[PDB]
């Protein structure tokens, strides 16, 4: 249904012709600072149309009760207004960063091998501004942003539309998060992909490419030293490792910039994914 | 944790060195026919090891309380054994089929071009005996499979592993299973998808590869009849064409069968999904 | 949390001095006609304050989606709203009545003794009409409603409050409802009317006063037939008799009218429980 | 279903006529010491059958995985099994105390006055051992229990049964457990005691007869300080007081030992909500 997470809950509202779209966030720990001004920047991305909190904060900051969002005239809005405290939770608590970009654009692929360490050193430095300095194509590599900038507009050209691949890394991620056997992390972050609208899938790590290289390659401490190849993840569960996975879109109504636009919905999904696993993974360290 | 489901449900147990592996099936309907020996053909088939129900059937049949299985002496035989379940209650509420099988083992890839007429033929014909009728390595493909198993040796005499893909088809589905917008069906595959050991990804439909055809190509009525590119899914909800779908897996302790083992796992949890859809979807018609 | 049933679900937000109160009901069929109208009534029933749906409706039906509800300026609103939803659900797919009232105010008690054949008579016939027409003490016994008004005023007048006891009638109820071990229907409603706030407790049937009666007066066919004892259900689900169970609310801030306005709270959360299990059985009769 | 809990999950399994019942405890942290003989004792007093643990442990400690029970040849085994787990999970992490007796057999009553300082008081010492040393009828008052053993020799001479009300407190409970607006501490404990067979209620704190008392008493500092009249819970969540809360049961095939052997049942269920609402409540202490 409409409701995801199990601590950390968002159900959403909306189609496209109704009175209002929003959110009820619940599970947000009392004492935090929040208004809107928290919310309003990951929203305005969802262009490469406002917000108000009904509920669940007093004189800026959380009560620990239902947080309440609408935004006035399905819709994925609720998603990313949602995740935009999942965000700041996770910040706060922990210095977590997530990045997500555009990888590919119809036929043409950003090298993303993860055994070649510059995608290596990319998924150790990209950052949301980096990714926005682009441009709307949000590809932070130059030499294929500009040929995925021609594609989109040789299929706008021909009245017709595109896919492409978005690619999300999450650094400083603790370790033991994730709930093994059947909601692992990855299992986590997979449901969560596969729900936003025009995907088509979710791999993570070394995924279908590396479905190609032999296991003593994947697992040699050198190739030099060994590369991140599993994605961050162990038995299902964070290793303290990046973990970066990606996302390919369908296009079709024509778009064609369903890709570069979808970025702020996987953060976003990323983001309510990691604060319930973060949560969880407190009830029993404590325990 | 290690529950999954809503409606059916199954919780598992058992690590490598303990008395016991199993599982409590929790939400079959009363009245159906069920022994073990529903139950170890799919289990025998994890090998290119036993199995007593505790409770939960008399005289043959189900008595809609919860059915412990065990087998003497983490490990995946619950989700197999519940599985065996699933597909019986779907094949006799349906005729639904269930029929995975390998289509990438290393470097080496059968073609499954959703636009190939070829790939969509076979989709539509594969079943469970022709896919073991090539042996072991269960790919349907003999100008390939010959080339996969000379892969595996391979890697196999540099005391090495590597992995492969799994390809899963399902037909005459029901139209109307799934649970927008978090619980889509497709959502809920890749959530158990994820889950099993080595599994790096989920694709249905188009994917990966189609993410470089234009959306005219996926949409149009001829290209000749339009081919299934959604895998079976539209707004998240089966549209009653065939559901395919494809998850890599890692090899690494090396393997290297680690692929063609995993076809019955893919196929139960396949089974555990569209079994609680099922549920779900009749919970609503009704009303 | 603030999310209640598994799939005719409620998610409530709104405290005192915030924006706005209301809920997000998921799981309503779609094709039901719903208007603000259907939801008024139960709401003014809360004294013995508007409502706007925002989503889920279209040229007035139900559209299978998340209808959001909000009223302008915790609160137990969203609890009624959602509540009038799941009473005109289970009115049409069903003809089920559910009727509470005044039972107790302080010292001054209605006889509800389960053996009482003027009680079952009342359990039979008594209506929400019939209620109201007692004025706001709404107690259906004139021998007794007086001086439950009088034993009011002599709190009013020492600055003071009192409880009460709320009990409630639902009839016409399929067979078959509840999901024992764990949560068999009692246990649904129980659960229920203890998240009412002031709410002290729940019992159904013959409850604490049919613990001084032997087990052969429970259960033998005459006593002059056998009453409904059980409260309508055995094994926990369902027996198609009558359900009926009392609810015990503190007075305290001050009251004294606590108890005769919990009425549409409890009629509310009663409903909420009934779609819900409905559905849930439905599920199952299928299969 | 046959599942319990969020966090501190019980699935349960077993009829009267099958190969064995059973439980498995999901969501244990790993290194605690567990091993049969913490179970045994606690079964042992469900009369006033052996047991052995499948999985989940090694070398005498909790690996955190899941842990199977069984016992060769519905039951409330497996919940008394789970429960004995819970019991020492809150023992270790907190010293709680959870402590149920006999208050009421047929028409005998123990006083359970809130308002009396000598309940209180038996609140504040009573143990299980003391409970034990009264025999079977488990009744610490002593001006009644002996009346309570013929009343139970009344009715088993008239080949008879009748039922009674077990009462239990909870004593070092910490602060913040419960999960309002739906999952309130007495909301899940309410849930908890109605799913136990043969029960018809559930009451916290003044309950029931506290309707009968004015605010001003339950609330005014002295009355000689204020009692206990809540039960141990203000806006549903625990507030460090002794939480109790009393139960009645029905005696009908006859018992009538219903009430004496229903008290471990009463303890288990209670710890596995307790156990359950710690772990809650630290997810989001850390958050």
Chains 1, 2, 3, 4 share one sequence.
Request: glycine share 10%.
């Amino acid at each position: 249904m409409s409701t995801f997470g199990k601590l950390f809950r968002v159900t959403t509202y909306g189609e496209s012709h109704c009175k209002s779209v929003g959110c009820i966030v619940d599970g947000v720990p009392p004492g935090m600072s929040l208004t809107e001004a928290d919310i309003q920047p990951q929203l305005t991305r969802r262009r490469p149309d406002r917000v108000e909190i009904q509920s669940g904060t007093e004189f800026g900051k959380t009560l620990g009760t239902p947080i309440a969002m609408m935004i006035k005239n399905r819709e994925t809005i609720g998603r990313v207004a949602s995740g935009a405290i999942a965000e700041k939770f996770l910040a706060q608590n922990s210095n977590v960063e997530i990045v997500a970009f555009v990888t590919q654009i119809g036929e043409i692929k950003m090298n993303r091998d993860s055994f070649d360490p510059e995608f290596q050193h990319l998924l150790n430095t990209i950052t949301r501004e980096k990714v926005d300095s682009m441009g709307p194509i949000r590809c932070p590599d130059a030499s294929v942003a500009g040929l995925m900038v021609k594609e989109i507009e040789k299929y706008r050209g021909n009245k017709d539309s595109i896919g492409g691949v978005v690619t999300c890394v999450v650094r400083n991620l603790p370790t033991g998060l994730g709930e093994p056997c059947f909601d692992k992390l990855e299992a986590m972050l997979a449901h969560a992909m596969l729900s936003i609208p025009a995907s088509k899938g979710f791999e993570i790590g070394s995924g279908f490419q590396g479905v190609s290289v032999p296991g003593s390659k994947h697992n040699d401490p050198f190739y030099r030293t060994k590369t991140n190849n599993s994605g961050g993840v162990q038995g299902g569960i964070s290793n303290g490792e990046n973990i970066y996975f990606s996302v390919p879109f369908k296009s079709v109504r024509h778009d064609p910039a369903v890709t570069p636009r979808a970025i702020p919905i996987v953060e976003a999904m990323t983001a309510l994914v990691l604060a319930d696993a973060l949560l969880i993974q407190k009830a029993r360290d404590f325990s």
